[PDB]
Symmetry: C4
Subunit: 230 residues, 4 copies
Amino acid sequence: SHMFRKLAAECFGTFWLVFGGCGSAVLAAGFPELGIGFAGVALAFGLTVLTMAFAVGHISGGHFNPAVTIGLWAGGRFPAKEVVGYVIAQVVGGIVAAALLYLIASGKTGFDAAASGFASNGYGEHSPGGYSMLSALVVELVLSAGFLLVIHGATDKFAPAGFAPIAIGLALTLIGLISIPVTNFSVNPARSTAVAIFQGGWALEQLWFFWVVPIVGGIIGGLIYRTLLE
Amino acid sequence: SHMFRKLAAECFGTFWLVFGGCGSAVLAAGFPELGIGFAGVALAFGLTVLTMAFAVGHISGGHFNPAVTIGLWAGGRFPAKEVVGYVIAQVVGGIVAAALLYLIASGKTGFDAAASGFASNGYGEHSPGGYSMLSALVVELVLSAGFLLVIHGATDKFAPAGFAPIAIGLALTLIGLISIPVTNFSVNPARSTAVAIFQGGWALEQLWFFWVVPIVGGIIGGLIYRTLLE
Amino acid sequence: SHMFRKLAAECFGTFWLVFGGCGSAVLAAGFPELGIGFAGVALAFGLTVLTMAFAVGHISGGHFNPAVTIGLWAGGRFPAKEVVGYVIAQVVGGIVAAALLYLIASGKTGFDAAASGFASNGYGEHSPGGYSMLSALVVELVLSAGFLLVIHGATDKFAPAGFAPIAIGLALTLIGLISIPVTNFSVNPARSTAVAIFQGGWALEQLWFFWVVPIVGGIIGGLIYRTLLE
Amino acid sequence: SHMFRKLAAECFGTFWLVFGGCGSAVLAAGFPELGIGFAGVALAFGLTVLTMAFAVGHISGGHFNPAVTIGLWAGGRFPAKEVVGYVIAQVVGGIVAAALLYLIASGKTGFDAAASGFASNGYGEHSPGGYSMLSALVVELVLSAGFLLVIHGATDKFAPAGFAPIAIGLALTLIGLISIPVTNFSVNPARSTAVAIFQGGWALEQLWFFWVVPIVGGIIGGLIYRTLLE
Ligand SMILES: CCCCCCCCO[C@@H]1O[C@H](CO)[C@@H](O)[C@H](O)[C@H]1O
Ligand SMILES: CCCCCCCCO[C@@H]1O[C@H](CO)[C@@H](O)[C@H](O)[C@H]1O
Ligand SMILES: CCCCCCCCO[C@@H]1O[C@H](CO)[C@@H](O)[C@H](O)[C@H]1O
Ligand SMILES: CCCCCCCCO[C@@H]1O[C@H](CO)[C@@H](O)[C@H](O)[C@H]1O
Ligand SMILES: CCCCCCCCO[C@@H]1O[C@H](CO)[C@@H](O)[C@H](O)[C@H]1O
Ligand SMILES: CCCCCCCCO[C@@H]1O[C@H](CO)[C@@H](O)[C@H](O)[C@H]1O
Ligand SMILES: CCCCCCCCO[C@@H]1O[C@H](CO)[C@@H](O)[C@H](O)[C@H]1O
Ligand SMILES: CCCCCCCCO[C@@H]1O[C@H](CO)[C@@H](O)[C@H](O)[C@H]1O
Ligand SMILES: CCCCCCCCO[C@@H]1O[C@H](CO)[C@@H](O)[C@H](O)[C@H]1O
Ligand SMILES: CCCCCCCCO[C@@H]1O[C@H](CO)[C@@H](O)[C@H](O)[C@H]1O
Ligand SMILES: CCCCCCCCO[C@@H]1O[C@H](CO)[C@@H](O)[C@H](O)[C@H]1O
Ligand SMILES: CCCCCCCCO[C@@H]1O[C@H](CO)[C@@H](O)[C@H](O)[C@H]1O
């Protein structure tokens, strides 16, 4: 390969994840009477990873998420020296998606990124269901770890080949089905950053949480698989 | 093979796509209280491609969509000389499905293709959610491109064999989960043409949009995979 | 094998299909506020076939449906001399499921098989959405044929191995997403017979329709694949 | 392997099953207007098994359920001498998940495990839909058996390799789509025990039912496959 091809793969991948997951949230989740709800948004997120893990996993590894890249580092599956590049690529790709999404959302009368939240992640006063900071920590930490345990397990040498995109993408949908009401569903700092920039207020103030927690969580997940299961 | 067998495969395939996707929209999406919604219609579309990509992909390649055929051309995966045949086959198959659908829908009191839209694609005044022409362009262009990037990636030499119908069909569902509110969900000019003919007014007047945009989009998608990822 | 093992497989399979599909309809579809709707029932039907096609397909072929058995006969994939046995096994298995379902449904105050329809298939006055006999014919005929075209295609020599239960089971879900409002969703005479016996009135009077149409449809589907695609 | 690695795999697996299935029920099922419903909870349960069967099935066998372990024993697929260890591991993992879930749920004003039921399984007066003890028996018994018949079938020597997590996990979703209204959906004594401890009243009093029935059911399922199908 070239590192170029993979960075491009991680960029387009993460663009897809934010464009489709958050796009479904901003455009479709709450459409009157026929809209897709939390379940639909959780399905869309998972499908973005399933579809691009099959399309470009064989190029980059198909992370699309800085907590994945860093957790694969910690699990001994990914070299330290490529981490930063992946993370930049992921972040940039997400930003470009959020931008196009914002443009799309603006073509409907009454749109307002700041007031609606633009699908940004938050806790306490900004949890969709009114959950505390501690509820948000526990849920992003466990779900992050489990996501990474699934990613390690499903790509294990002895895991039957080819199925990983289904396991990994459906694991993200599951995570969505649990967590939207607590944090508006992250486990991914590039996904949180992308839309926080356009929400423009509280989302930027809590954004640090959705860097630290999902990463510590993904590190833990990696360490669990490597030291206890592999 | 014979070119006959494949054209038949592309025809039946596209018939299935319109009969099931648009059929679910016209018959089931809005059924009171128990109807399937946008999420259900997005699932049905994706399943039509998943199921016929597994059934007849090994015959024709399983495009079922003129933007797919033309994007595979641009991506260097499909010969120029078979394009037109595929596109005619796709269009004809879709028309026959729309016709049977119209017959089916007419067996219920109060049906009216023109007033309900017969699941036709539109923008501005005819976007289901009131989105502008520019919102519609950006969304059909990005989603078209991404669809084709997924189709190229998932059928890459190095993509694990056999899984492509799942990636491709679920990618279409994802696209549905995002876009119904903006354009009533196209990325497919045969799907747009099929029902526009029976809607019979505005749908025919905007039909040109849902030829040009999804194609330019599918070309871009192909060019991205070929020049930057493959 | 023994013919015993396969008949048992076809019996348990069809029991599963009726117990889960119709069970989900009678127990869960319309539960206030949280019930699963037409989409949920369509998913359950498809999952019964996906799960038992993986569990016992390698024994019997995994038909679970007299229109499948007879359409595989017509498509040249299944010997005439085993048809009747399969069909009896399928019918018996469905009846035993309907019976247990009726017992389960009766443990809730107010249950009434005859008035609710017990998820029976009907047309005209007994179509859930008020569709005519002709709308019901066209929809059961097309969907039956397509189901059988998918079953033939997905189990073709050149179809990648192992995936057929996913294609076939998801094809049934798709069929459910389209057709519930027209006929309450059949494409399967054992599924129609099972519950008609407990509905006990109109369902028995229209039951003949849901033998003839799905079969003619499944025959057509088989003939299409064999003569035009294979 | 080490028995350690597998017990860890069964523990984390079952933790995932309770954290995600019951978590989705307690956090997301009934969220106003956008919540995921019974269908969403049934999807989440199934996805927990699909995702961890792919991640750790190759280590432990991926049971995550004492009725699975004991039914595989009865079906001649799993040695008597490892049963108890698995069952303890499963139970412990579920308890730790219920505990974290309770902590998470408590960060929202008005939460109350005892009054809401904390997603506990019950019958009669504690069936979500008002079903009798007999309705609950028949449904947990049939669904348990079928679950185990699917698990045996899908992991049969002659079942195509690698697909079992999809069959098994989707079988659990199906089971969820049928049974929530009757028993709040068990077929798993560790899943019932986990949350009963935090519900703290009636759930503990009926907990015995959701040990005995799912086990007798899973034994029957195993015996059916071994003696009649294999
Ligand atoms: C990988 C490159 C992106 C790094 C993520 C940026 C983390 C943002 O951190 C945020 O920014 C502000 C800093 O003054 C604080 O006010 C906020 O409370 C905090 O959320
Ligand atoms: C990779 C890009 C990361 C961007 C992180 C920027 C952190 C923004 O920080 C935010 O700045 C805003 C005004 O400029 C204010 O509304 C907030 O109070 C402040 O926390
Ligand atoms: C990687 C992005 C920054 C992570 C720093 C870890 C510790 C930060 O700690 C937090 O920083 C917040 C934002 O400024 C403060 O508002 C909080 O009081 C503080 O607890
Ligand atoms: C592949 C064969 C089908 C070609 C697609 C036809 C494109 C239709 O183009 C349409 O038709 C009219 C032309 O006068 C215009 O009035 C409409 O505004 C335009 O949508
Ligand atoms: C492959 C078949 C493509 C059919 C495209 C036909 C373009 C139709 O064009 C339409 O004709 C209608 C009346 O005849 C009018 O209602 C519209 O104003 C006009 O744009
Ligand atoms: C392939 C089908 C036609 C594509 C032509 C590309 C440029 C068309 O351009 C458009 O044509 C519309 C329909 O007539 C006009 O109404 C619009 O003003 C015009 O912008
Ligand atoms: C495979 C064995 C089962 C055969 C299916 C039975 C078809 C039932 O046929 C039915 O029965 C009655 C016959 O007098 C008629 O009154 C009904 O209108 C007709 O639906
Ligand atoms: C395999 C079993 C098939 C059973 C088909 C039986 C056909 C029943 O036929 C029905 O009998 C009922 C009363 O007995 C009446 O309500 C109906 O008018 C009559 O059509
Ligand atoms: C396989 C089950 C019977 C199929 C017979 C095919 C032709 C039946 O024909 C139909 O029979 C109905 C039921 O008696 C009558 O009520 C209808 O008038 C008649 O059209
Ligand atoms: C594998 C280790 C856990 C065993 C499961 C415990 C079964 C609980 O059994 C319960 O406990 C009480 C006993 O006095 C009774 O009052 C309850 O009615 C009964 O549900
Ligand atoms: C593996 C752990 C299994 C725990 C099973 C414990 C059985 C509890 O039993 C319950 O005790 C409660 C008060 O302590 C009472 O509310 C109930 O009446 C009683 O049945
Ligand atoms: C494995 C957990 C205990 C299973 C014992 C099987 C028979 C129990 O039997 C039941 O025990 C209940 C709980 O105490 C009583 O309340 C019921 O009356 C009794 O029928």
